[PDB]
Amino acid sequence: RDHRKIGKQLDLYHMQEEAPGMVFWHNDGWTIFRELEVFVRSKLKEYQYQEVKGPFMMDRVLWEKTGHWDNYKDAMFTTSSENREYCIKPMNCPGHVQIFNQGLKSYRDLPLRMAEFGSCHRNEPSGSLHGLMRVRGFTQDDAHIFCTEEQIRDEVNGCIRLVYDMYSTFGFEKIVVKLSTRPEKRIGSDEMWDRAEADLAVALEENNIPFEYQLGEGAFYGPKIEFTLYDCLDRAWQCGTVQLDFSLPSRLSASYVGEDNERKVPVMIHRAILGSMERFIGILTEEFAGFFPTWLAPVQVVIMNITDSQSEYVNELTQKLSNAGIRVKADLRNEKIGFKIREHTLRRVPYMLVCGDKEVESGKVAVRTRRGKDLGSMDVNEVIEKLQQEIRSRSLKQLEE
């Protein structure tokens, strides 16, 4: 169930030697990506996350202040303009702090949850690249929560709930979790690390989450919980993650007015639920073997004619399903119906509607599924409602299965 082969077969994306680890999302792959963004946005609205967009690059001075220049230099791409040096962002956190720093903040504004579908670039060693799982340019479903020390428990709990809730939609209910502790190269005192590692360990146990400690694998700025999903070859991939940061806000001069009217430095929780769109889509492609649930399917329905005689009927139904919000395409090619059906079956199109003369003068449609099931003759409005229901509920199963 190699996602790279499936990606080619379903025309989802491609990569080239001229852009190692740089993904070209084709129309169908991009549709999946966009549906995942819609899903993430829907889930975050529930938590009142703001959504922002930060700059693609920032001055070297900024990255020196955060600690990235000294602890993350090899992974960063650099460029220049007018003798000024810039780093293309490998993370979205610094930009989020810059936004937080605009306008006086008070304890009343916390917790402040700031999300971004942030494009990150990291100069990963070429030999470590692997399909969509490890690339050089990727988009994270990122967010940073600015809060008080007393709010850490609840905010970390909120991130954890988000992970399990969102993962359950895809059928993932068996997650291997790691707590990666202080790395050799790091910022912050040992006292700070003791406190942060403890906070995360307690959060995991309070949630009855079995986890394994992982020596020296934390971020340079804080310990991290890793939510692990496996690929077809049983290789572990870090997808969701939660990190506790007591260093970056101070380094970037972030503060707020406490209730005691004194200036305080907020705590920052970093988290990505899916991880990156690229990696998560890679995992989903292998998990479903290309049979994406209807809500995620690039093309949900294909309508085919037998001969040019049903073309008009097919075009009418196509526009009708399209107006109903279904991703539909008409296949009016001069090919045998069995040839068309095989093609769309291989493309994993959830539903196929066949229209012969009988369907045209009946006003109905013959329905088939990509699993080869013959659903017989159905009413057009009936198929539309059933599809809309399957889509709205983001169901893992198709009609009658």
Annotated binding site for Zn(2+): 93, 144, 270
Residue 266 carries which DSSP code? P
Residue 111 carries which DSSP code? S
Residues in the annotated binding site: 5-8, 68, 72-76, 84, 93, 101-108, 122-124, 134-135, 138, 140, 144, 221, 238-239, 243, 248-262, 270, 276, 279, 306-308, 334-345, 348, 354-359, 368, 374
What is the per-residue binding string for ligand TSB in 78-97, x denoting contact by CB under 6 A? -------------x-x----
Helix (H, G, I), strand (E, B) or coil at 337: helix
Q: Which residue's CB is nearer to ligand TSB, number 193 or number 313?
A: 193
When CB distances are held under 5 to 8 angstroms depending on the partner's kind, the choice from ligand TSB, a second copy, Zn ion, none that residue 305 binds is none
Q: Residue 230: which residues within 8 A CB-CB, separation 6 or more?
A: 176, 236, 237
Structure token pair of residue 130: 């692997």
Clarify whether 144 is annotated catalytic.
yes
Residues 83 and 80: their CA atoms lie apart, in Å, by 6
The reply on whether position 52 binds a second copy by CB under 8 A is yes
Amino acid at the residue 133: M
With CB under 8 A as the rule, give the number of residues binding a second copy.
53
Q: Which residue's CB is nearer to ligand TSB, number 162 or number 317?
A: 162
Clarify whether 121 is annotated catalytic.
no
Clarify whether 142 is annotated catalytic.
yes
The region that residue 156 occupies, defined by phi over 0 for left and psi between -120 and 50 for alpha, beta otherwise, is alpha
Residues 367 and 296: their CA atoms lie apart, in Å, by 20
Q: Which residue's CB is nearer to ligand TSB, number 75 or number 324?
A: 75
Residues 57-116 that bind a second copy (CB under 8 A): 57-59, 61-62, 77-82, 84, 86, 88, 95, 98-99, 102-103, 114
Residues 222 and 270: their CA atoms lie apart, in Å, by 9
Please count the other Cβ atoms lying within 10 Å of the Cβ belonging to residue 43.
Answer: 15
Q: Which residue's CB is nearer to ligand TSB, number 270 or number 348?
A: 270
* Omega cis (within 30) before 111: yes
Clarify whether 224 is annotated catalytic.
yes
> Least Å distance between CB 25 and a second copy?
4
Structure token pair of residue 393: 């509920």
> Of 279, 327, 340, 364, which lies in the binding site for ligand TSB, with binding defined by CB under 6 A?
279
List of E strands, 319-396: 328-331, 351-355, 364-369, 374-379
Residues 310-339 that bind a second copy (CB under 8 A): 322
Contact 286, 1 (CB under 8 A): yes
Clarify whether 370 is annotated catalytic.
no
Polymer length of the chain: 401
b/e map 218-233, b = 16+ CB within 10 Å: bbbbbbbbbbbbbbee
Question: Which of 113, 121, 144, 182 is the catalytic position?
Answer: 144
Return the active site residues: 93, 122, 140, 142, 144, 224, 270
Interface positions with ligand TSB (CB under 6 A): 91, 93, 122, 124, 134-135, 138, 140, 142, 238-239, 241, 270-272, 275-276, 278-279
Interface positions with a second copy (CB under 8 A): 11, 14, 16-20, 22-27, 30-31, 33-34, 45, 50-59, 61-62, 77-82, 84, 86, 88, 95, 98-99, 102-103, 114, 119, 121, 123, 125-126, 136-137, 322
